[PDB]
Design a protein around this ligand. Structure first.
Ligand SMILES: COc1cccc([C@@H](C)NC(=O)Nc2nc(-c3ccncc3)cs2)c1
Ligand SMILES: COc1cccc([C@@H](C)NC(=O)Nc2nc(-c3ccncc3)cs2)c1
Lengths: 397, 394
């Protein structure tokens, strides 16, 4: 077991999970230069001499390290209002990735400076077939960049658009979602916003989760709360809605609610709590006992109905509170086509036909930004606008 | 393109982006941000709380002062002290120079240790004391050097009457050592007995390079300030105060001259009871230089001394080290210039333990309160000149 203090420090430098690993240490030096280098501050001798020594070296480094210009944008596949996701090709390696941008200016402006750490940890270290991998995370003074495996199948929102979905497809996406969720729960995170938008497909037609921006680390009892605004409460559980009003905390069972909702939308074509307005949808969720109706549209399966209803109940009696297993054993999941262990080796309901490695078919065209980039007021003293982003850099090796 | 090369940039002990400089960066940053006034900036407060745990940990993992037992305090330079220290685990004994960050700020003069670090680390010479590790905390820089139980020429000079035979030896060694330094591109200035140390076998090493400077093309330097030890300072360097001039490596040779005088005469040539007096006699050396009336001293001894204590442009060594080596004062049957360090030193120190302090004067401790920095209301970047100082030998 024993290691010397020198050995231990060496491990800190080399460990991708360490915040003092070499790449993170360059980040600091970089940021510090960014934030110090200004005529006003250069009047300080310590600062002026320091920037003279290191700057020539800092230019070598900024030249050497990965950068936005190592990639060319093929297209824009999504917009998050903190930035865009865009299809890219690496110039030297020819390889094709999806790339998320985050505006540093926007983040300082609105706060929301701390929120991307969990997404980073998850996509970097999950090492799951159920989770989109981040290959590189790097940055400059303007932006964060997350370079991710591209998922040409598109999301489940697109799928529900182009296909009516039989219980046989539903069961399958549902099961994969169960697994990705469980994977994420086992790393100690609660996803907390689980939607068809966050479910994408690889060239095989298999599902991965993306967009972990809402994810929070659970503690001991496996609970959390965050202050975070949520676009639509369509898939959001009642106890999460209550929590936003200060009331209290909650556990991973909130994610199983979303899945209950996801199923209903796949079979029935509609969100169960759908209303013309946010307020209406909101009331309906809080009303869920009396507000949840199975369709005009059909009789659909006794078993499907029962799973959906088991997920869409109140949290204390809700399916999945006793763990993933009682979910897996639900009779809704019985079939001849796949078993839980073999699921990803099955052939998928929809296997994308793709013209090229650049095929955008399953995504909507994203027109343009072409907006003029906002800049900060020149510091009269040190404001450290780069500090929140220090240690973000990651290279998978 | 394959690329990285940052592997080498990170691994090069001479690289400024190497791992230890990178860690010095983060360490300096935290020290300099941690303050009530500065934590009112949220950017800062948030960064400090994020990296605090990991920073406390690094500080402990990396080499620190607590890793050493202080045995005796063997010197004080008013920029700090020099201690004989023993590593608490390895049990190895080392010399450690403490440089105060507070003082190198107050007096400015924050840049001088770089060349000293550079030399002691990478010289790889039997003529130059070797730097093993360098580290720092908020208060100090720490240089850890090979220990030199032989002591310095001043101690030797007080305990003995140096015969010409010995002076030939020590001068010759100083000469070879200086040459090596010159060949690395530096002018020492500051050549005085106090910086000449004897190893366990009694051979000579140069230390305290804090005053060194790097030559250019013609091998000169441009300096308008005069550098230390009034007794040993050359006319050029004295005169260079007040904007004057720019000069080469023969100011060191001048000090070798003073050194030789001191050993054989037992006094300094420019001694007076004020430095003011000494500066003056130095300017007037052409007159003020005299040997004692009694004297029994070889003519060629006095000649060599006189060849050094002349003006720079006629100064022995101005042509090359060779004209010094060929001087008749060095003529003898015992040793040759290339083998000289393999010969048997005139004094081989007798030592009790590896810890033996007998050849160093008695010094004690500060006993004073640490005079420390005022809390900033804004980023002063006070640690920034020290980033990249840390060194580990392997
Ligand atoms: C708040 O900041 C944001 C910046 C950009 C985008 C977003 C939104 C749309 N959510 C998201 O992560 N969507 C993502 N889609 C992928 C993706 C898509 C296709 N192929 C590979 C990856 C990653 S994240 C938010
Ligand atoms: C520049 O500011 C100063 C700060 C503290 C001390 C000094 C003096 C004592 N000179 C010096 O470096 N002396 C040296 N002694 C050694 C040494 C001693 C014993 N064994 C090996 C080396 C190196 S430098 C100056």
């Amino acid at each position: 077991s024993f290691e010397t203090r020198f050995e231990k420090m060496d491990n800190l430098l080399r460990d991708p999970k360490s915040e003092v690993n070499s790449d993170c240490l360059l980040d600091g030096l970089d940021a510090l230069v960014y934030d110090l280098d200004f005529p006003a501050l250069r009047k300080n001798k310590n600062i002026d001499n320091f920037l003279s020594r290191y700057k020539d070296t800092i230019n070598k480094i900024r030249d050497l390290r990965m950068k936005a210009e190592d990639y060319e944008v093929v297209k824009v596949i999504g917009r998050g209002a903190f930035g865009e996701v865009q299809l890219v090709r690496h110039k030297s390696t020819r390889k094709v990735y999806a790339m998320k941008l985050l505006s540093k200016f926007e983040m300082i402006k609105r706060s929301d400076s701390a929120f991307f750490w969990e997404e980073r940890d998850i996509m970097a270290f999950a090492n799951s077939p159920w989770v989109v991998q981040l290959f590189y995370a790097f940055q400059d003074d303007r932006y964060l960049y997350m370079v991710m495996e591209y998922m040409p199948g598109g999301d489940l929102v697109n799928l529900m658009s182009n296909y009516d979905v039989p219980e046989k497809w539903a069961r399958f996406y549902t099961a994969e979602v169960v697994l990705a969720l469980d994977a994420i729960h086992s790393m100690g995170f609660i996803h907390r916003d689980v939607k068809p938008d966050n479910m994408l497909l690889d060239k095989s037609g298999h599902l991965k989760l993306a967009d972990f921006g809402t994810c929070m680390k659970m503690n001991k009892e496996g609970m959390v709360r965050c202050d975070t605004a949520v676009g639509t409460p369509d898939y959001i559980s009642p106890e999460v809605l209550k929590s936003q009003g200060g009331d209290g905390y909650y556990g991973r069972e909130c994610d199983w609610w979303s899945v209950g909702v996801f199923l209903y939308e796949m079979l029935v074509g509609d969100t169960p709590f759908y209303a013309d307005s946010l307020v209406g949808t909101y009331s309906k969720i809080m009303n869920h006992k009396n507000s949840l109706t199975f369709p005009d549209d059909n009789d659909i399966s006794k078993e499907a109905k029962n799973l959906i209803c088991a997920f869409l109940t109140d949290r204390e009696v809700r399916l999945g509170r006793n763990g993933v297993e009682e979910i897996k054993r639900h009779l809704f999941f019985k079939n001849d086509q796949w078993a839980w262990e073999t699921l990803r080796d099955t052939v998928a309901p929809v296997v994308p036909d793709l013209s090229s490695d650049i095929d955008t078919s399953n995504f909507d065209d994203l027109e343009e930004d072409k907006g003029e980039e906002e800049t900060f007021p020149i510091p009269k003293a040190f404001v450290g606008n780069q500090l929140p982003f220090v240690g973000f850099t990651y290279y998978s090796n």
